[PDB]
Design a protein around this ligand. Structure first.
Ligand SMILES: [Mg+2]
Lengths: 443, 368, 259, 255
């Protein structure tokens, strides 16, 4: 059927009164202070917020009016987003949203989404099967918004997105959609040519923000069968006839394009900064918890700096095509200066954690596993530390010494297990096991 | 068909196994410290036992190029053997490689010394190494090998190197509480001096304990590993029994010559493995009457009676032979008349278990 | 008359997974989610996968509840290797799963009395095996241990039930967290700044669709509104007593009788 | 109605379940560190076994692609504080060279623990997915008892031949699913006059002495080696010395 983003409901929000609803683009547009974005997938929430931020940038570029805070958005944005009704369309005879040149290669709808397993080099998955169950229109839209932000490598032959492998994504958060849009508003002089227009002209480099935030690395056509589904069995909400498959090709991202994502975190050498999460506890890695500590040095130095607000971090850990884990976190912040070397030390806690794991009970060799019982109590102490991450980051009354003493009781009760003797030497070696703590390192 | 060996062995003050710091191996069992002998030490002592020279047929070495070069009086080929091994998957003088000795000698001499191609010669060497699994020590101990996929060429394929182990050995835990002891040794200077001091001062660590040893042999897996030659399987079983009864681990035996022989061996024939170490969960305390071997044998007989009167199958009777030198230590001293065939000779015991295995005599099977 | 039903959630391990887990890393939340306790009650009644969907969720979901955390269990990560294929091939699936170790929870659901009575009756008679969120986590204490009662608010119900000491000399939390569904108060009344979102309102359960909800935490202080209980048992075994005496009067009569 | 099986099994020093770094699997209970065997480890050990292989049986007992299997097992929490140990191994080059030692020269991990193992079966749903075959369900429950009585986790056992048998099994037919893990909030301290298994079984007995004060119980120990409750008190309905008659009594109670 004819589907439009403007009138048909595709956004999952919860109202501040407490009623969750699927609503359209106009409803989340002109309310903007009674609802909060509510998506089960955190990076779905971030991609929808990125789309709304890009729409606000387009509205400002065509109206020149800032969104003042504590008061909903300007009312001149709705007629500018309304008169192009055929424009944000998934159907119809004309331009289509996030769709491109003609296609031949066909892939299932399961790979557009990332959270549901896809057709791997296997046959069995997490109880999914391609070409049998499909996603709804809202799920298809939220999967299409995942393309410019969270597209990974497809085996070193298929290229990544416009911001390389999907890095850490950091932004400013508030209890309202008005505060959602206002706290992440900082624009640039050149906007760019976004992909909800037609085939954009490449011309020169330095696209800006609006062209780079909405870059399309994939395509979608989908072949519509005669009728369709009767009852949904993939999304969870029982809906009408749904999709079955799609058609995806790739576009080679060219060389150069000196460009910085406003929300991305970039290393010292300019490469993307990744989420350090993997279940594979290797020789050089010790699995602890969500790595909120990692994207802190670059974001608090270059893009955003110290600023009063909430820091929402989204981390999609990946290694080539292996979708490892997605997590999000909220950090309070006031902007009370910035200590350089301490925040740099905090920027890599995994090194000190792995170093503390690799230290053996008694021994000197360095390729040993160290103490594997410590590796099961580092996660709980890391989870206890991660609650006061704002006070850790700004260093008001929380520091490295004040937080790594939260390992103490777990260390005592692991040392009870590792030295299960009531002797003098066992007690002394237990006490030496007590004082083990992650000495910080300079890089 | 599982052959189960439960041995009770009292040892003189000795240090058969030691850890990094030169202490006897200790493990917690039943909440108390027990002297431990590693299963790998027992397996090595069995494989290097005097009852195994006519049966030992496997080498586990990383210096394979040395072995291949040793069958060449004048044909100097060591760098090319190292290169073909490096391309085979080993990364260096290699990783540890286990296979037969006559196989590596003859086949590697006729394969890698031949002036021929290079990649397919490595494939031939890999096939020779993987397929050389016809050795009863390899059949008992088991082996699988994985070469480095980085240094290996993409044109070399490896077949299945997984040899399933037909032998399970438990760590020999003491029947009583562990008694770690310290030996204060000096080393006198053979030339005199003005000071009269030792050349070296140290502390050795030793322990005397009554160990419980446990072995399990899978007959079907043993004849699957060694293929249809069942004569070699019976020879392997007899050689294992003789070696386990008559060989001790070669620890500090030059300083602690503890070559005591086991006072009790139970050889049981059953389809499910039983650990009788739960007999010694309660530590054995000495008393005025009887000795430690008698007390341990009594506790073991109590648990054997409890297991037979407990876990019992009418479809598969439990049956085993009890060993004591000239019937010195009986098993069921009070009531447990379970051992039907108390046997007072090792050769008689080997003959009886070989007869239960099938139509095999020890002299007939000592020819493979 | 009793408008509150109580659930006791205690086991060796427990895992109420959060929203950010259906990948191979499958973490847990610090408190029992609403979908978890709702599923426990659904098993206690014993309806099917879709019978929960067919008009059973909002009857149990409009029951604004609270969860009271007695002691904080620590987060233990288990290294779970799924065999995948053991049509089949030698590939091993890798996973790490989070569990709450040594934690006790009390869940108070407030609703109309007849639903509470039916819930307690089905809790005493679980037609299916119930557990602590994951099937490998059976409860160590009865889920129907604490009897239902009538209470006006969630706070009174969650402060009435005492805190049970497992043994005689154990450190008890001086401060005790409580996490409740956000009471809207009057009509309107947009949620306060401390109201966090939680995607644990079930509306379909195969596949699981979760709706967001507003979740607010208060703190309780033991000794003034939460009171401890007695030990009600013995911990150690201590086998029976030897060392008969030689001066008691019951000894001499038997001694003279044997003579 | 629910059949609950609480098994106490003392294992000789071994490594039955390995984590990522090779350690024995470890849990946290009673305010102390315990040795753990994962539930899926015991599940796969009971499954795929010729001891157990001797509408579809064993699909209902352990599920395969909304089966909701009748039998599930808890993680094996030890009754005492875990005692993990380093074993140091070397692998000889067994070819005469100028040096010595060639292998990994590494370290393995092992632990000995007395595990409490909980099993729960629902009878009614086990009949339900068996399409009303009550006799087949009774036979497969007896087969579960036979297997789980004499199957161990087939972990690292070639170098650690741990084939110990359980010294105590308690089977009840109670109303609500309860685990007796709370019995071992006390880690078992070993005394001179009693062993670890006797003290663990005594802790279980002193805990089932409660609960009833504020159902039945079949107790199995091999030839009455460990009696549940060292008194004449009505704590165990039937002290059973052999596993076959235990299975027979349970089956004739059920049907
Ligand atoms: Mg959906």
């Amino acid at each position: 059927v004819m589907y439009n983003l403007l009138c048909d409901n595709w956004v999952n929000v919860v109202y501040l009164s407490g009623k969750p609803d699927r609503i359209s683009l106009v409803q989340t547009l002109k309310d903007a202070h009674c609802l909060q974005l509510a998506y089960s997938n955190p990076m779905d929430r971030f991609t929808v917020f990125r789309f709304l931020l890009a729409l606000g940038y387009w509205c400002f570029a065509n109206t020149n009016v800032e969104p003042e805070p504590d008061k909903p958005l300007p009312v001149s944005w709705i007629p500018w987003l309304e008169e192009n009704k055929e424009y944000f369309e998934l159907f119809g005879d004309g331009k289509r949203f996030f769709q491109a040149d003609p296609s031949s290669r066909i892939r299932a709808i399961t790979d557009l989404i990332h959270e549901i397993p896809t057709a791997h080099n296997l046959c069995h998955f997490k109880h999914v099967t391609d070409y049998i169950d499909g996603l709804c229109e809202a799920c298809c839209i939220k999967g299409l918004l995942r393309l410019p932000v969270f597209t990974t490598v497809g085996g070193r032959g298929i290229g990544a997105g416009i911001n390389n492998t999907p890095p850490f994504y950091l932004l400013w958060h508030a209890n309202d959609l008005a505060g959602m849009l206002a706290q992440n508003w900082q624009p640039w002089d050149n906007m760019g040519i976004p992909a909800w227009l037609g085939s954009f002209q490449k011309e020169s480099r330095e696209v800006g923000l609006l062209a780079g935030m909405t870059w399309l690395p994939r395509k979608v056509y989908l072949h519509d069968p005669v009728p369709g589904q009767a009852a949904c069995c993939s999304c969870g909400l029982p809906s009408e006839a749904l999709v079955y498959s799609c058609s995806i090709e790739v576009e080679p991202v060219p060389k150069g394009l000196e460009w910085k994502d406003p929300h991305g975190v970039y290393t010292d050498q300019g490469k993307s900064l990744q989420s350090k999460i993997k279940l594979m506890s290797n020789d050089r890695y010790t699995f602890a918890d969500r790595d909120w500590y990692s994207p802190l040095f670059s974001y608090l130095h270059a893009e955003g700096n110290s600023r009063q607000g909430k820091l929402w971090l989204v981390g999609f850990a990946s290694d080539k095509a292996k979708s490892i884990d997605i997590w999000d976190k909220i950090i309070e912040l006031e902007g009370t200066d910035t200590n350089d070397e301490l925040l740099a030390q905090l920027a890599n806690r995994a090194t000190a954690l792995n170093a503390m794991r690799k230290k053996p009970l008694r021994g000197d060799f360095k390729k040993s596993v160290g103490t594997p019982q410590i590796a099961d109590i580092i996660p709980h102490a890391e989870n206890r530390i991660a609650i006061n991450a704002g006070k850790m980051t700004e260093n008001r009354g929380y520091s490295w010494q004040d937080a790594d003493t939260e390992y103490g009781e777990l260390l005592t009760k692991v040392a009870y297990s590792l030295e299960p003797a009531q002797t003098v030497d066992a007690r002394l070696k237990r006490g030496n096991f007590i004082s083990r703590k992650p000495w910080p390192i300079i890089p | 068909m599982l052959i189960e060996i439960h041995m009770i062995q009292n040892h003189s003050p000795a240090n058969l196994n030691r850890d990094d710091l030169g202490a006897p191996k200790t493990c917690y069992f039943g909440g108390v410290l027990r002297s431990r002998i590693s299963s790998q030490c027992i397996k090595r002592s069995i494989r290097t036992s005097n009852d195994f020279k006519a049966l030992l047929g496997g080498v586990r070495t990383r210096r394979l190029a040395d072995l291949i070069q040793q069958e060449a009086g004048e044909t100097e080929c060591w760098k090319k053997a190292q290169e073909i091994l490096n391309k085979c998957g080993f990364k260096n003088t290699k990783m540890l490689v286990f296979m037969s000795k006559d196989k590596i000698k003859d086949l590697a001499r006729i394969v890698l010394d031949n002036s021929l191609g290079l990649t397919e010669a490595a494939q031939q060497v890999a096939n020779v190494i993987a397929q050389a699994t016809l050795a009863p020590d390899i059949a008992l101990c088991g082996r699988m090998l994985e070469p480095n996929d980085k240094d290996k060429d993409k044109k070399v394929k490896w077949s299945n190197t997984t040899v399933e182990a037909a032998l399970q050995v438990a760590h020999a835990i003491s029947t009583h509480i562990a008694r770690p002891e310290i030996d204060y040794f000096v080393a006198a200077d053979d030339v005199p001096g003005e000071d009269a001091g030792a050349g070296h001062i140290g502390e050795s660590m030793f322990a005397s304990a009554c160990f419980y040893k446990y072995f399990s042999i899978d007959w079907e897996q043993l004849v699957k590993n060694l293929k249809g030659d069942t004569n070699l399987a019976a020879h392997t079983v007899g050689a294992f029994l003789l070696a386990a009864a008559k060989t001790n681990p070669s620890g500090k035996q030059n300083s602690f010559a503890a070559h005591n022989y086991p006072d009790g061996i139970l050889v049981e024939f059953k389809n499910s493995p039983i650990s009788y170490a739960n007999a010694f969960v309660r530590p054995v305390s000495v008393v005025k009457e009887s000795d430690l071997v008698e007390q341990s044998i009594g506790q073991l007989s109590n648990y054997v009676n409890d297991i037979r009167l407990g876990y019992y199958d009418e479809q598969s009777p439990v049956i085993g032979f009890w060993f004591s030198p000239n019937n010195r230590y009986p098993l069921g001293y009070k009531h447990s008349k379970l051992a039907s065939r108390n046997i007072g000779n090792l050769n008689e015991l080997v003959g009886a278990v070989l007869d239960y295995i099938g139509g095999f005599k020890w002299e007939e099977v000592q020819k493979s | 008359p009793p408008n509150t039903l109580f659930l006791r959630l205690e086991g060796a391990l427990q895992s109420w997974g959060s929203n950010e887990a259906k990948f191979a890393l499958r973490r847990t939340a610090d408190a029992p989610t609403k979908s978890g306790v709702l599923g426990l009650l659904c098993a206690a009644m014993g309806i099917g996968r879709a019978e929960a969907a067919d008009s059973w969720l909002p009857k149990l979901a409009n029951l604004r509840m609270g969860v009271r955390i007695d002691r904080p269990g620590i987060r233990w990560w288990d290294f779970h290797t799924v065999g995948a294929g053991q049509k089949t091939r030698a590939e091993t699936l890798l996973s790490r799963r989070e569990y709450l170790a040594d934690a006790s929870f009390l869940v108070a659901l407030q609703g109309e009395p007849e639903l509470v009575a039916k819930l307690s009756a089905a809790l005493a008679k679980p037609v299916w095996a119930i557990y602590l969120g994951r099937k490998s986590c059976p409860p160590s204490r009865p889920v129907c241990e604490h009897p239902p009662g009538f209470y006006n608010t969630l706070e009174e119900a969650l402060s009435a039930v005492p805190l049970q000491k497992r043994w005689h000399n154990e450190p008890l939390p001086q401060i005790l967290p409580c996490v409740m569904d956000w009471i809207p108060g009057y009509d309107g009344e947009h949620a306060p700044d401390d109201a966090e979102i939680h995607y644990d309102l079930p509306v379909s359960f195969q596949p699981p669709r979760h709706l967001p909800r507003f979740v607010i935490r208060r703190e309780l202080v033991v000794g003034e509104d939460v009171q401890v209980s007695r030990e009600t048992g013995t911990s150690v075994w201590r086998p029976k007593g030897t060392r008969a005496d030689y001066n008691n009067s019951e000894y001499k009569k038997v001694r003279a009788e044997r003579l």
